[PDB]
Structure 1
Amino acid sequence: QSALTQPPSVSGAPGQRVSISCTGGSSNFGAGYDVHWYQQLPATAPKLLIYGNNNRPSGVPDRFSGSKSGTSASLAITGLQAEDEGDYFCQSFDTSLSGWIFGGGTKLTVLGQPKAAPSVTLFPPSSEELQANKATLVCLISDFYPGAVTVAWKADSSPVKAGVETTTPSKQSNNKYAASSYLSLTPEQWKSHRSYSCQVTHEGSTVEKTVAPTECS
């Protein structure tokens, strides 16, 4: 094959070990071209992790090693750290294409991280937004782990599904997950109902916050 294949993802506990396979073909690895490995942390540029199958440049700890058999390479990581989370790419050169190739990349997830309940705050429509004939309920969900959350909206006591947009959760620079849900309403809907509620379910616990049109006077 004239491309490199990596597993989509590999997970491991902190202090444990993980292995990332990078298989190629006779036109790259089998021809004699070595494999290079690149580490790309969240929101940063790729960094040369391992070059020449098993060599480490300045700054790479001994916890990263590599092997290559001429058709299948392997990046092993011993003693997993939380900062090891990211995407790891292998790379070589292919003689049948006469061009450099990259592996699909492997997302390294470090399990066992400390769980965190979400911090939930529900915002009513701003007066400025209401003067624009638009009303959006903002439910901000921050500082939780793991990333799985479920958001449900309630007008008074009844569920609401129309006009709801919930972001896919993603890790922020604080190494915690954050998410948001927006309930788009007309000014008449907001003023007619007694209250609106945002329900956030996360790992066996559900938090609900409620706003009302006349809660501030």
Structure 2
Amino acid sequence: QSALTQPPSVSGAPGQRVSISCTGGSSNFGAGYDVHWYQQLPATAPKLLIYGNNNRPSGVPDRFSGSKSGTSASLAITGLQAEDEGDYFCQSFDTSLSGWIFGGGTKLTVLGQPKAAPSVTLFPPSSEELQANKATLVCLISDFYPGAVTVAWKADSSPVKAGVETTTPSKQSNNKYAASSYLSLTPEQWKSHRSYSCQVTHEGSTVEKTVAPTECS
């Protein structure tokens, strides 16, 4: 086969060991070419992790190791750390295609990290936005794990679903997740209610923050 095949995903818990397979074919690994591996952390360029089947560049931890026999290669990761989450690609050269080839990428997930409750900060509309005849409430949600939350909005005590846009959570630098929710209102809605609230549910608890148009009066 003139393509490299890797599993789409692998997972393990902190401190555990995982491996990522990559198989090729007669025209790449079978033609004598080595495998290289690249690590792509979220929102970053690929970085060389293993070259020439089993060699580590300077700085790469010895928890990463590689082997290859025939058309079968494998990247082993021992002592998994949350910092290891990302996409891992194998690479070789292929004679039938006359070019470099990459596997499809394996997403590594480190499950079972310590639970963390979200911090929630709610922002009212700015003076400038109101002068432009618009109003957006912004609910910023940080420092939570696992990376699933649900967000609910209320105007006074009534649930509001219209006008809500909520992001999918994204991992931040400290391995916890972040998300946001936006409630678009007219200036009349903002000014004519007693308050608005953002409620964030995570792992069996809900936390609620409230803002009111005359709070900083």
Task: Pick the TM interval, shorter chain.
Answer: over 0.9
The alpha-carbon distance between structure 1 residues 13 and 145, as it changes in their structure 2 partners (threshold 3 A), is same
Aligned mates of 1:119, 1:38 — CA distance in 2: 34
Q: CA deviation at 1:118?
A: 0.6
Deviations 1:36-80 (A, max 9, x none): 111222333322211121222333333222222322211111111
Q: Judge conservation of contact 2:164–2:184 (CA < 8 Å) in 1.
A: yes
2 CA distance for matches of 1:40 and 1:181?
Answer: 28
Deviations 1:20-39 (Å, cap 9, x if unpaired)?
01122222112221111112
Percent of aligned pairs with the same residue?
Answer: 100
Gaps of 5+ in 2: none
Q: Partner of 1:146: helix, strand, or coil?
A: coil
TM-score by length of 2: 0.93
Misfit runs of 4+, over 6 Å: none
Q: Larger deviation: 48-57 or 174-183?
A: 48-57
Question: Structure 1 CA distance, aligned partners of 2:77 and 2:134?
Answer: 52
More deviation, 207-216/161-170: 207-216
Shift of 1:203: 0.9
**In structure 2, distance between residues paired with 1:57 and 1:127:** 53
Aligned length, in residue pairs: 217
SS of 1:30's partner is: helix
CA contact (8 A) 2:83 2:175 kept: no
Q: Is the 8 A contact 2:147 2:169 kept in 1?
A: yes
For 1:30 and 1:39, how far apart are their aligned partners in 2? 24
Distance in 2 between the 1:22 and 1:104 partners? 10
| CA shift in 2, pair 1:123/1:59, >3 Å | closer
Q: Any conservation in 1 of the 2:82–2:175 contact (CA below 8 Å)?
A: no
**3-state DSSP of counterpart to 1:213:** coil
**Long gaps (5+) in structure 1:** none
